[PDB]
Amino acid sequence: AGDCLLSAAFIAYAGYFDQQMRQNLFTTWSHHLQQANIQFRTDIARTEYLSNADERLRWQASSLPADDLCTENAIMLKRFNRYPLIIDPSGQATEFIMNEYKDRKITRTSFLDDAFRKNLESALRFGNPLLVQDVESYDPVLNPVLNREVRRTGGRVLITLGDQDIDLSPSFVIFLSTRDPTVEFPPDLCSRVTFVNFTVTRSSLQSQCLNEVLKAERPDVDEKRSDLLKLQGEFQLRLRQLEKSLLQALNEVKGRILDDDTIITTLENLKREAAEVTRKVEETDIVMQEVETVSQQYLPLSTACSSIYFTMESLKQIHFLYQYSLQFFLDIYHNVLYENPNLKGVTDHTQRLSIITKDLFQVAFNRVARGMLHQDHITFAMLLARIKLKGTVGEPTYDAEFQHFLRGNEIVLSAGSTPRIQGLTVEQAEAVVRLSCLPAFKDLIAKVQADEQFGIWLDSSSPEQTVPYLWSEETPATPIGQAIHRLLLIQAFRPDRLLAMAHMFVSTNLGESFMSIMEQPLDLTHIVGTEVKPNTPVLMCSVPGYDASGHVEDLAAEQNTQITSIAIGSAEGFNQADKAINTAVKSGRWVMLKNVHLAPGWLMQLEKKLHSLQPHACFRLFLTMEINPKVPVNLLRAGRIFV
């Protein structure tokens, strides 16, 4: 009774809140039930109570992310009373629904589409699951069906739509989806439909990456972790069916008054199977250091992955061209765990985790920086360096040092606060007195006064290479601590070398060859060969005064691939591009679109068409473009950027 109460409370409610809020609500309900002694089982999980093994495996085959939030969302999607409203900024929910309902030939439809009403009536007549990818422009014709106003006239279930009456089919289900996670809805909407949030929060992506690394790397020990998954699987099934077969043979009303009844010995096998289930539960108890450890060894990896991806999202603030989706980071993750030559000859597991995280950082940087201006490469490199520094456990967190390094200029000074140090300019003196606020730099002015090599170092071409020892610390510092302290010194002293010393700091953090790939030109042949999907177009966004056609032409010629190059100048260009792409989808040849920035709406239409299309594996779409804000954000999110 209590377990069903909690299950239904979680099903009807908690459909919009994130993982932390859902857990808080569940904890509050469980605490209240405990106070009233409503006996509810605690060992069971919400993801398991309402789900079956066959359904879970079908969802896995239907490409359900392993995150427990997504499993709960699938559970709510399966059983409901009001038609769900899915919010999927990632975009995984739409493909999950399509794969799940492919057998029922679910038809896609958009509210903006004029044929939406025709698709709706077709779904009602035939009884087909229907999906609408946009509901922000809500059309109120669904108010009656959402309210389920049904009139039972004769043997007919009849729905009043507008001024027409349409027969209803029980098999018909309508699914509402929104791409925007920031949209607000009128209260009638949240009253009429239930919410199924698919927003990928920090905890959500953290758990997803943890499960992905558990499955991909450590695969037979992923089955050692799934010893918990099999304890009540193919294991307890044998116990229960052995009990029921024993019941089948228990009294067949045969051999009455017979001293021969060895069938009792099969209860020994019953006890052995029950003991197998219970001892696998005790293996889940051994998870006090078994699977909790398989999880916590990769916990830094998953935390770093979440931090990396949210840095990747928030990178859109510094420039309109830096638009990256979940699928891009997931492709990065798959390329790190799979098809990685660095682990071909590597078997040790801790070292495999170490090389995996190193290659994760390296591949993430080498994939992001290709579509990033050269003036911003050091920014993302420093962000990744900070992420790795936080991840590693030995080093101090260095919050105060980084906070000062970022917010020194906000500190207010006075005319008398500057002691007018000889050999230093006024702005330099302000920097000295400001940075002396740090406890490690309190005696800095004395070091300025005492030192005599300051004159040559301050005026040297590259002071960052030979920064002297000024900060005073009672204990020897880590190389990273020395690097950040010298970075602060360079910022306060010779800000012109700040970028170079940032390069050195990233080198100390993430390896001396972290940027070594950047100096080399783009290896377009490998990028277009593998690691890119045929559906995803290649974006070559060049600044004014430069074209990217030559590099892709050389690529096509050297691969001996026939490529159709067309320019976007007018409607004739539109028709030629459409015909070329339609031919190349099935033939597999390459097609180039030049100066695509001229038509933003046509670009949006092309993105929408590309999503629906099914390109051949050899198909590659190159969109050379000018870097202007007129380009739709959706294409940038749905394509690989190369600046």
């Binding site: 009774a1 377990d3 069903c4 109460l5 299950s7 239904a8 409370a9 099903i11 009807a12 409610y13 919009y16 809140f17 809020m21 808080n24 609500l25 509050t28 309900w29 209240h32 039930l33 009233a36 409503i38 309402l50 059983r79 009373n81 009001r82 920031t182 607000e184 809805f185 209260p187 949240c190 009253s191 009429r192 239930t194 919410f195 029921k244 019941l247 228990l250 009294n251 009455r256 008054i257």
Partner: protein
């Protein structure tokens, strides 16, 4: 307990609104949906578990029959 669940959902919505995050109104229609889901889940799980329980009780009565058999 169900009433308290609804009240805490309202309180959580109010707290989320105070924090500044996006919130959606909770209507008594949500309470009706919760009660209906509770009814459906209770019926289904009780049906399955008690069918198995009835099988087990019939088995126990048959065990008593076998006890009588060994008795005579």
């Amino acid at each position: 307990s169900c009433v308290f669940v609804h009240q805490t959902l309202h309180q959580a919505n109010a707290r989320l609104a105070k924090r500044g995050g996006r919130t959606m109104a909770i209507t008594p229609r949500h309470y009706l949906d919760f009660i209906n889901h509770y009814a459906n889940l209770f019926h289904e799980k009780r049906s399955e578990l008690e069918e198995q329980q009835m099988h087990l009780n019939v088995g126990l009565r048959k065990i008593k029959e076998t006890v009588d058999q060994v008795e005579e």
